[PDB]
Design a protein around this ligand. Structure first.
Ligand SMILES: [K+]
Ligand SMILES: [Mg+2]
Ligand SMILES: [Mg+2]
Ligand SMILES: [Mg+2]
Ligand SMILES: [Mg+2]
Ligand SMILES: [Mg+2]
Ligand SMILES: [Mg+2]
Ligand SMILES: [Mg+2]
Ligand SMILES: [Mg+2]
Ligand SMILES: [Mg+2]
Ligand SMILES: [Mg+2]
Ligand SMILES: [Mg+2]
Lengths: 113, 70, 176
RNA sequence: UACUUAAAAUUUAAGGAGAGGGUAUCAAGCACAUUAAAAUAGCUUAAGACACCUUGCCUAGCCACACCCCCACGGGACUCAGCAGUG
RNA sequence: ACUAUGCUUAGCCAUAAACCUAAAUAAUUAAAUUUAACAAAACUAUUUGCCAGAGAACUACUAGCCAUAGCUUAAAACUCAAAGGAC
C-alpha cells in the first residue's frame, strides 16, 4: 500500500470548477516568502481531483488525498473530504449549522433533527 | 510655457505633413489592410492543415474583417 | 410578466390592516384609499410585501440578504417597465444595470452563506444565477472568427476518427 | 565488495512543496481535457498561457557538445573545440 | 449680406485646461509638523492605478474600433548637460 511520490500527499483547496466528469478542479494556496520584502504572499496551484460521486460544488473547501497511481496526466488526487460546503457550513467547534459569523441553530438548543 | 507651444508647434507641423501626403497615406493603408487580411487567412489555413484536414471545414469561408464592410 | 399583480381594489400599505378593522366604510372612502387613487410607488410597496410573505420566513425583517434581494427585484422590474417607454433615458438605463449588478452581488453572498435560502429565493423570484467566469475573454472580429474555425476544425477531426473506428470495428467483426 | 544473497558507488526513468532571463506593441493558445458503457465539452491564460529574443550554471563542481545535416540508418561542403604548431 | 452649423427625429464619432491641475476610504490635530516655496494647514493607515532626465514624441510601427486627413495603445535611433518647478 505504498504512497504516492508527489510531495502533496494532503492538499486543501477551494473547488474552482466542476465541469469535467467525475473530476473537480481545485485551487490550493500556499504561503511563499518574498526574499526582497521578507513578506509572505499566496502562491496558488491547481489540482485535479477524482470526485467519484460528483458531490462537489464550486466554492466549497475540500481535502484531497494523493492517489497511489496517477489516474491520468493531471488527475493525481482524489476527494478525501469536504471540509466546508458552500453555503452549508457546519461549525466544527459546536456542530451547529451556521451562515457566516452566526448560528442558524443556537448551540444552547438540542434539536436532534 | 514653451512646452505647450512646442506641442502646438509640433502638432501643427504634423497636421500640415499629413495634409501634404494624405493621398499617399490612403494607398498605404489600403495595402496594409490587404496584407493584414492575407496574414489572417494564412493563419487560419495553418490551423486546419496542421490538424490534418486537407480542406477547410465544410461550409467555411474566412470572413473578410478588414474590408469596407461597415 | 409575473404571476401576481396587485388589484386596483387593494388598499395602500398604510391602511391595509386598518380598514378591515373599521366596521363600515363607504365605497368612496375605500376607492380613495385603494390602489386606483395612488401613485405607482404605492403599488410597488404592495408587490414587495406580497413577495416577502411568500419567500422570507420572517417578513418582519427587511435587512436580510433575502429581503434585500426581493427589494431589488421589484425595483429591477420597475426600471424595466420604465425603459420600455423611455427608450432613450440614460439615467434610468444606468439605474437598471446597476441594480441588476447589485442583485448579483447579493445573490453571491447569499449563496456563500445560506445555500438553502439562496435556492428558494432564486426559484421563487425566478432569477437565474450564473457564477462569475474564472477568466475574462476578449472579443473582437479576428478572435471570434479564428475561435469559430478552431472549434469547427476540431469537430471535423473527431468526426473522422469516429467514422474510422466504426469501419475498423466493422471489418474486424466480419473476420470473426 | 560481500553472500550465493546485501551494503555501496554510479546512473536511468517517471515526477513536483518551492525557487528560476528579457519583450505584453507576444493577448490569446487551438486539442493544448475528463470519463472509460467509450461518452462529456472540456484544458492553459493578465497570479502572464502561446509566440519570439538572449544566455552555459548549480561552481569541491555540474550540464551540453565532439567536422556539418537538433539525431546520424543515410547523406554531405569529410574531422586538432587532445598537446605542440600553422594559415 | 449670406451658407455649413447651432434646433428636431434617428444613428455614428468618443474628443477638452473632460480642472477643485486634489484617486478613493477611515482616521488624528498631537506628535515641540512653515519641514522647501507657492497653492488648499499637516499627517497616518489601507487598496488599486501610474511615474523613473530632457528633446526626438499627442511621432513611427503594432492591434482594436461604424472611426478612412480619425481615436485609443506607444517605442528606438539620434542629440544635449541639462530640461523643469516655486519664489
Ligand atoms: K550537435
Ligand atoms: Mg511597435
Ligand atoms: Mg574544427
Ligand atoms: Mg552530432
Ligand atoms: Mg590546439
Ligand atoms: Mg579528435
Ligand atoms: Mg442655416
Ligand atoms: Mg479648472
Ligand atoms: Mg490629441
Ligand atoms: Mg497618432
Ligand atoms: Mg498608428
Ligand atoms: Mg531613450
Amino acid at each position: 500500500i505504498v504512497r504516492s511520490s508527489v510531495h502533496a500527499k494532503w492538499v486543501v483547496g477551494k473547488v474552482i470548477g466542476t465541469a469535467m466528469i467525475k473530476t473537480a478542479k481545485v485551487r490550493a494556496t500556499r504561503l511563499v516568502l518574498d526574499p526582497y520584502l521578507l513578506k509572505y504572499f499566496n502562491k496558488r496551484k491547481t489540482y485535479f481531483a477524482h470526485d467519484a460521486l460528483q458531490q462537489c460544488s464550486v466554492g466549497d473547501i475540500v481535502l484531497l488525498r494523493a492517489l497511489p497511481v496517477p489516474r491520468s496526466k493531471h488527475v493525481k488526487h482524489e476527494l478525501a473530504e469536504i471540509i466546508f460546503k458552500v453555503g452549508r457550513v457546519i461549525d466544527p467547534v459546536t456542530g451547529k449549522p451556521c451562515a457566516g459569523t452566526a448560528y442558524l441553530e443556537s448551540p444552547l438548543s438540542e434539536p436532534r433533527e | 510655457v514653451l512646452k505647450i507651444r512646442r506641442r502646438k508647434m509640433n502638432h501643427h507641423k504634423y497636421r500640415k505633413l499629413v495634409k501634404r501626403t494624405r493621398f499617399l497615406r490612403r494607398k498605404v493603408r489600403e495595402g496594409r489592410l490587404k496584407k493584414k487580411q492575407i496574414k489572417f487567412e494564412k493563419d487560419l489555413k495553418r490551423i486546419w492543415l496542421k490538424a490534418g484536414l486537407k480542406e477547410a471545414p465544410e461550409n467555411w469561408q474566412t470572413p473578410k474583417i478588414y474590408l469596407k464592410n461597415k | 410578466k409575473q404571476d401576481d399583480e396587485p388589484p386596483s381594489s387593494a388598499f395602500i400599505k398604510e391602511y391595509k390592516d386598518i380598514i378591515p378593522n373599521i366596521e363600515k366604510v363607504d365605497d368612496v372612502v375605500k376607492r380613495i384609499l385603494s390602489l386606483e387613487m395612488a401613485s405607482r410607488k404605492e403599488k410597488l410597496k404592495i408587490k414587495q410585501e406580497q413577495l416577502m410573505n411568500k419567500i422570507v420566513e420572517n417578513p418582519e425583517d427587511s435587512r436580510t440578504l433575502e429581503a434585500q434581494i426581493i427589494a431589488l427585484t421589484v425595483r429591477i422590474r420597475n426600471y424595466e417597465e420604465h425603459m420600455q417607454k423611455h427608450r432613450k433615458d440614460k439615467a434610468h438605463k444606468r439605474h437598471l444595470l446597476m441594480s441588476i449588478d447589485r442583485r448579483k452581488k447579493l445573490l453571491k453572498i447569499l449563496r456563500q452563506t445560506n445555500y438553502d435560502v439562496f435556492e428558494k429565493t432564486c426559484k421563487e423570484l425566478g432569477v437565474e444565477y450564473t457564477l462569475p467566469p474564472l477568466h475574462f475573454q476578449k472579443v473582437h472580429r479576428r478572435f471570434l472568427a479564428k475561435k469559430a474555425l478552431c472549434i469547427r476544425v476540431y469537430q471535423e477531426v473527431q468526426k473522422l476518427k469516429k467514422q474510422k473506428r466504426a469501419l475498423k470495428a466493422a471489418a474486424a467483426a466480419a473476420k470473426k
